[PDB]
């Protein structure tokens, strides 16, 4: 009964930036890990960055640490993936995806998920 509420992707130019949002509800505790995962066609989903919301702990894939930055909204069940330098290789489907503890987070296997935010990346 999680709910998550993604929004923020579309079709943007290489360098260009974009903003995701996800929000929670449904859940029953008050701090747990929430952030994205992407999926390229026919390949397997790979983390991209987390925070435990209501407080401060970030993780980033280093494929995407020096241009994207996580942020949270604890009163709003809120996370947000500032997406910079666009390159190419970004393009995919990013999922926001929770889990209580961070550390089973970032094995997706008893994640929440949403449904997922085309994000394109055009030359």
């Known amino acids: 009964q999680v709910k998550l509420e993604e929004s923020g992707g579309g079709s943007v130019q290489a360098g260009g930036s974009l903003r995701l949002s996800c929000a929670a509800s449904g859940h029953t505790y008050s701090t747990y890990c929430m952030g994205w995962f992407r999926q390229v066609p026919g390949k397997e989903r790979e983390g991209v960055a987390r925070?435990?919301?209501?407080?401060?702990?970030?993780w980033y894939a280093d494929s995407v640490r020096d241009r994207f930055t996580i942020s949270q909204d604890n009163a709003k069940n809120t996370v947000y993936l500032q997406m910079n330098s666009l390159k190419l290789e970004d393009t995919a489907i990013y999922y926001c995806?929770?889990?209580?503890?961070?550390?089973?987070?970032?094995?997706?296997?008893?994640?929440?998920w949403g449904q997922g935010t085309q994000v394109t990346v055009s030359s």
């Open positions: 995806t929770l889990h209580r503890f961070c550390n089973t987070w970032s094995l997706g296997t008893l994640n929440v």
């Open positions: 925070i435990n919301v209501g407080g401060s702990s970030t």
